[PDB]
Amino acid sequence: QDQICIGYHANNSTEQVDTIMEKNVTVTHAQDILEKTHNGKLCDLDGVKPLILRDCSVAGWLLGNPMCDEFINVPEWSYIVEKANPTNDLCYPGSFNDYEELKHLLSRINHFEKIQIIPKSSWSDHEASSGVSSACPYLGSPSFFRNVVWLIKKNSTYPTIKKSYNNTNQEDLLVLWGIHHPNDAAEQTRLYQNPTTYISIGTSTLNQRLVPKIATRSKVNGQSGRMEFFWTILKPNDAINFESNGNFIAPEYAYKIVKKGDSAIMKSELEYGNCNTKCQTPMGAINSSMPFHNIHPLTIGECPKYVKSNRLVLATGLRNS
Amino acid sequence: QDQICIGYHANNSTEQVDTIMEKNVTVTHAQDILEKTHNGKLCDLDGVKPLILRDCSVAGWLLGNPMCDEFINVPEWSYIVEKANPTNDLCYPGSFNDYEELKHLLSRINHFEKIQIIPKSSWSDHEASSGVSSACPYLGSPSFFRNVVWLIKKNSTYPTIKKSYNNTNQEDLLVLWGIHHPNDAAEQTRLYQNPTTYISIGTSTLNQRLVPKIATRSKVNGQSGRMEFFWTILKPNDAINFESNGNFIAPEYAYKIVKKGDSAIMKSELEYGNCNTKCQTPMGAINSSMPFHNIHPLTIGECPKYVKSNRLVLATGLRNS
Amino acid sequence: QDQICIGYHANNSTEQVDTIMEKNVTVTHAQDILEKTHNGKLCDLDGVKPLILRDCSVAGWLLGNPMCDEFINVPEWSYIVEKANPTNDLCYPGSFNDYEELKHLLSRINHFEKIQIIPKSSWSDHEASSGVSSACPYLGSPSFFRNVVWLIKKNSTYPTIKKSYNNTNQEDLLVLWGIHHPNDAAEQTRLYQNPTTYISIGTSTLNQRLVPKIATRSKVNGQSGRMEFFWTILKPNDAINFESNGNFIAPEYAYKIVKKGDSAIMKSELEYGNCNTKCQTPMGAINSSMPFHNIHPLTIGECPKYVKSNRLVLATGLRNS
Amino acid sequence: GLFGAIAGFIEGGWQGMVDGWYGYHHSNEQGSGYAADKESTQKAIDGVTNKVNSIIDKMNTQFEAVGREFNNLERRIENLNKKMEDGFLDVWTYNAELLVLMENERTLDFHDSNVKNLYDKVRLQLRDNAKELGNGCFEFYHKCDNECMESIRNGTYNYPQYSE
Amino acid sequence: GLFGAIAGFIEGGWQGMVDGWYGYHHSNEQGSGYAADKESTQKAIDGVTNKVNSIIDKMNTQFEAVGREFNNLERRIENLNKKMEDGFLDVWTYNAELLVLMENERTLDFHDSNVKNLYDKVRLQLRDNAKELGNGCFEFYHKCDNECMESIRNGTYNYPQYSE
Amino acid sequence: GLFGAIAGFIEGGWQGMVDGWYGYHHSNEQGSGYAADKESTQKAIDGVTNKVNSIIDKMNTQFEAVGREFNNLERRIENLNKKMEDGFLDVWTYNAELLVLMENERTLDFHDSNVKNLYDKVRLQLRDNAKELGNGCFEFYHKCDNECMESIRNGTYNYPQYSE
């Protein structure tokens, strides 16, 4: 006696999915949609290599910490990698004004071009090769941040400086300078004859006046004195004006901003793998077609969408047995 | 042979909806729940007209930029509309302290009443009608912000000012003042005989001391000098105290805050349409009963809930064919 | 004739649930998952009592407002409860630098140990028991904040102070100090012979210089003068250095931070109930196994997840009738 | 469909029926016609209406962006403000789109369900006295005048009437 | 309901049945009674229990508001703080309310489904040997003692027993 | 399952069928075999494929955390930044996990549904000419060669062929 039956596919797949009422339901076909793997390397992003600061900070790099010569002339980068706690930062102790806002600026920058705006040789009436310290040693010898100059008195006189620089380039200019806060009055006269000093700085936008703070403080890297650093962005065709009768850490090299674009400052201890990728995290790169991942929130490049899941499997086929 | 059938409605509607498994499913009845239209006009909100700054900024308005006379006596507003980049702002260059926080204050204010707190005529020992500049021209003639007074020396003397003002009104008082930062010492003595000057300001809450910064700077609107403006809110029954021996841009007109309430500062290039509405966006008004809209996030009034969708159609009836 | 029927449970439960298409559907079994009750008391959290400031603020407590003696030696706390508007705050008017950031610090602290770092008796060349005011009365008598000392001139002379304190303890040290801003020059010489004064303060991290502002201001609690207070965290083995020739409100008692951990600053008007709980809100404690609650967002302890619902009932059984 | 009725065993819908969502077509010696089943139609109306109002009422407290201004040295917090408001915008957009898709499908399978249960209502009644053609239609073995038809529509069909 | 059983072809529920969610009432020469169907009842229990625990476990990491204080010149960031915490509060409230509505409806149609499938289980077994009354009841054409009833409850009904 | 077919009246699935998700096994004088039902299989494929692509496309604009740095006196806003990004992370994680659970269950009941409707398709056709065994199988009362079998598979079965 003839017969006809209605039935459904079954196979030997052991792929399980979860539903709202039942966990670990075996199915015939399933699509996993969560990437859970990385290469453990820091890679170029689309052929353009990252900037891997080593044991230097952004400040040590920008100001030119003698220990950071690896980064004197840095090419175009995709993103910036900094370690959690860089060892080479402010060799001469002190502070950096609006450091975090500047780091934020670097997120939108992919290339600097270093240019000498006020040559160390142009100082006729001050000494310009004696602003060195054992707090910033280079090869066992007293030195200083390379992009600025610690000017000191010449022949027991520190004439007031009036210096101006007109940004003639077509790019925005990152300009850095500093003030020295000495530990005592004797030090003040010894370095800059004048007891009572100031540094004024003015642009079309900037109007500031610095006075050094002479005071006794605990020693960091052997110094009771402090260096305080400042920065600004000179617009194309705006000039920057400095006037000072002491304690002036003058700019010499500034940074043309020749490439704006997406970038990021990554915190990672990893170093440079010789590879290339489309998506980079602080713990490794991702090559996936997957829509989701669970590796790291802080991503850069053409990346899946981060999610805090350990498993995301979508049922496509039907119930097995 | 008699028969009975079970069936369902079908019509000639072509309204489609989308489901999770199928796109563009034709149905008999459907409700669209997304408003996608506006009038392209800036309208009164419930009968109360907005404040439409033209080519003036909030600063040009409040300080009384000569080019902003349209807004010398402004009536009650619902919301404030400012252009993306207003041309009339600080005619004499300089800055405005906590500008953004003040703009934030205006979000909660719907009406000012301008009052003269220190008359231009009450200055006996200083000149009060000579603080004008070609940076702030009125009808081709040197002028100045109208709500403050650039006091200058009289008969080669600038006696120290001690002025106090007690807020006797029952409303909070917005009070503005400024300091002049000159470009050189000669200018300092020329304007205010005294070389070394200050402005102190004190309330029950405020305790500040200003010193002008004499320095050379690049020219904005022909001036190397700067004007720096400050503000405070005088409480009912608190007094404000000024003391100064130079560089003092004194208040003359302050602003009673006679109406607190919801308001907003809108960025829009549009101008005043002679209309009325319940919901306003920077690109036009919305008259809808709809729950959702896709026009603009920044809404004011009794408005639908913004959403980034291009289409939101809910099925109510059943599948057509 | 024998028969068999298929049927389902029904009972006399009146518990209703809501669905997307129908409201108030009666069911046989249901689970409510929203806690809606509290005890109306402020309780210990797991046996460790909160710190209940009464009519004192954090500032009045830390600086030692004479009216806040209840909190001279405070034991370990779980969380801190402050009233909306405490009456005892800065008895002598003035301000507290970075007050909000410090309150934020207290969120991560559960125990202070007060220590005398510079004894009131160690001042040989200045007066140390004459810095009292009727603005800070104790038992109807002029007094002052107990943790700092308002030093005044001795024998018509105020020699410059150089004082240093090395944090020898293994814990971080919260250190407070202040400056006096007088209302006039006569007051300045009367209190501190020297007309032109400063206070410099320096650590490995801190480098600040204060100058008092002599000015006329409206009276708060009878004083036109102001006290301005500052704080810092001295690291283990770092020293703090003070130098001053006037207007120095010196530290005497500082606070060892002996317990870091989770804590919170609660705004509540309630007082101490003699109870214990696992979860505390500003309006009462919660003893529930429930996953959700609707009492207060600002929770501390092992708590359900706050939600703005008035009712959350999940159907488990089936439709009644 | 999930329940097999709409575009299932019933081929297509009736252009003819205009007073309801589901119903009957009858044919007898007194003639032919369409009638709408009020109970299932009305209950369906309540269902979908309440669905619309629930969907609407659950999104009455969404997230309104207000405007904040930041200066040239407040770029971090400006970026935070922007990113947060975009964030909320995105969760709410997602929620709306998703809810619409889901409840649209639920609505369709709800109507399909209503049709099948109506069909089962007549089927369970006529048991032996008619034959299932297979397409939503029942061919009677007895004569079924208008009163008998209505007795089937309101649910009171008196089965005690032979049919062989 | 979606599957037509609860408040459908079965008029109402049984106040009498107390040991289960779904089951049988039998009537024979040995007497009458109710029995609960353990398999479908238990499976239903597991279903809903796991639903409750899933709903609960998916919301164990929601959003806890902490307190931040701002001064008179930090009104922009204060407003940002407030707006953000309200935002999260609102997405989570929406999520909870929505999830509850949806899964309540799923639960109800789940029980309805279980009832209909139980009914189909008996129906498919008795085929010819009983008649469908139309209301969830089967009238036997043969005598069905307690052992036969139980054989229908556990699924082993031996159809080889004529009935005309 | 919700519709009673998969792991319901049909005991288990067919390891034998490899060209489709649902189908037929036939047995006659010309022999036996499996065939896949293309229409329901294909429609099912479209359904689930589009579900996957919808789920994916609705989450293409989620929330990307960027890095912000704060100093030792910006702890309030630092905490705000962290709490907000955690917040978004949590709403999106919840959404993903939830969506997956829900649509997995919908997928399973969708396949179950397809199976039952296929079974009903054959049942409605064979009416009298075969008997329902109760397990998804129909025993013919007439001879059904391959052409007749195919006529049942494509839906054109010519019922006019007696069977007593």
Ligand SMILES: *[C@@H]1O[C@H](CO)[C@@H](O)[C@H](O)[C@H]1NC(C)=O
């Ligand atoms: C810089 O130079 C340009 C011409 O090369 C001049 O127009 C401009 O005024 C200068 N910038 C300043 C602010 O001095």
Ligand SMILES: *[C@@H]1O[C@H](CO)[C@@H](O)[C@H](O)[C@H]1NC(C)=O
């Ligand atoms: C302002 O005037 C009122 C009396 O009209 C007085 O009580 C108050 O003290 C004055 N304000 C100040 C701070 O001088």
Ligand SMILES: *[C@@H]1O[C@H](CO)[C@@H](O)[C@H](O)[C@H]1NC(C)=O
């Ligand atoms: C504090 O004392 C320790 C030794 O007890 C010393 O090493 C350290 O340098 C001192 N701190 C400072 C900064 O003076």
